Amino acid sequence: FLVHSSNNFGAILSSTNVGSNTY
Amino acid sequence: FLVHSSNNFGAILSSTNVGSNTY
Amino acid sequence: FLVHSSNNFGAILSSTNVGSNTY
Amino acid sequence: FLVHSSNNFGAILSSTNVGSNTY
Amino acid sequence: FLVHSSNNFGAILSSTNVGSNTY
Amino acid sequence: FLVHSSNNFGAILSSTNVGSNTY
Amino acid sequence: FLVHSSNNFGAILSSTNVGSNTY
Amino acid sequence: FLVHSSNNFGAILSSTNVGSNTY
Amino acid sequence: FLVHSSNNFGAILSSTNVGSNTY
Amino acid sequence: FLVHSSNNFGAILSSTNVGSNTY
Amino acid sequence: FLVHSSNNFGAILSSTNVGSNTY
Amino acid sequence: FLVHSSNNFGAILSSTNVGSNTY
């Protein structure tokens, strides 16, 4: 018997930069 | 019997920079 | 019988820089 | 019988820089 | 029977720099 | 029977620098 | 007069997971 | 007068997963 | 007159997990 | 007149976990 | 006239965990 | 006239845990 509940009521602003690597 | 509840009511601002490595 | 409850009501500002390493 | 409750009502500002290592 | 309760009502400002090592 | 309660009502400012070692 | 030279002769294996956040 | 030279002679294996967030 | 030279001849293995935060 | 030279000839293994915070 | 030279010939193993904070 | 030379020929093992704070 497993129960997983996730409730979100809030504003979420996200910025993600992955890279910009010089080889 | 397992119960996992996560409730979020707050604003979340996130910035993530992964990289910028010179090799 | 396991119960895990996480409630968040507060603003969260986060900044994460992982990298900028010169090799 | 295990109970883990975490309630957060406060503003959280975080800054994390991991790196900037010269090899 | 184990109970772990953590309640936070206060502002938390954190700064973390891990690195800046010259090899 | 184990009970662990931690309540925080105070502002917490933290600064952590781990590194800056020349090898 | 600015000169930026980056030469890489070594194998580079990288894994990056950004996310897996429950709101 | 600006000169930017990047030469790469090495194998580069990369894996990037951005996401898997439950809202 | 500025000169920045970075030469890498060594194997580099990196793993980065940013996230896994429950709100 | 500025000269910055970084030469790396050694294997570098790194693991970085930033997060896993419960709010 | 400024000269900064960093030469690394040794294996470097690093582990960094930043977080795991309960609020 | 400034000269900064850092040469490393030795194995370096490091472990860093920053956090695990209950608020």
Numbering used by the authors:
A (entry chain B), B (entry chain D), C (entry chain F), D (entry chain H), E (entry chain J), F (entry chain L), ...: 15 to 37
What does the paper say about this structure?
Cryo-EM was performed on fibrils assembled from 30 μM IAPP in the same buffer used for kinetic assays (160 mM ammonium acetate, pH 7.4, 1% v/v DMSO), in the absence (4 replicates) or presence (2 replicates each) of 50 μM YX-I-1, canagliflozin, or doxazosin. The majority of fibrils formed in the control (69%) and doxazosin-treated (72%) samples were classified into three related fibril structures (named LL, LLU, and LLUU, respectively), which have a shared structural core consisting of a pair of protofilaments related by a 21-screw symmetry. Each protofilament is formed from a single stack of L-shaped IAPP subunits, with straight β-strand segments encompassing 13ANFLVHSSNNF23 and 25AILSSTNVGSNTY37-NH2, hinging on a turn at Gly24. In addition, further flanking subunits presenting U-shaped IAPP subunit conformations and ambiguous β-strands were observed adhering to these two β-sheets, with the combinations of these flanking subunits differing to generate the three individual polymorphs LL, LLU, and LLUU. Thus, out of the fibril structures that were identified in each data set, YX-I-1 fibrils consisted of 89% C-fold subunits, whereas this subunit fold was absent from fibrils grown in the control or with doxazosin. By contrast, the control and doxazosin-treated samples consisted of L-fold (62% or 72%, respectively), U-fold (34% or 28%), and S-fold (4% or 0%) subunits.
Islet amyloid polypeptide (IAPP, or amylin) is a 37-residue peptide hormone that is cosecreted with insulin and one of the most amyloid-prone sequences known. Although the precise link between IAPP aggregation and disease remains uncertain, IAPP aggregates have been shown to be toxic in cell-based assays, and genetic and animal studies implicate islet amyloid in the progressive loss of pancreatic β-cell function.
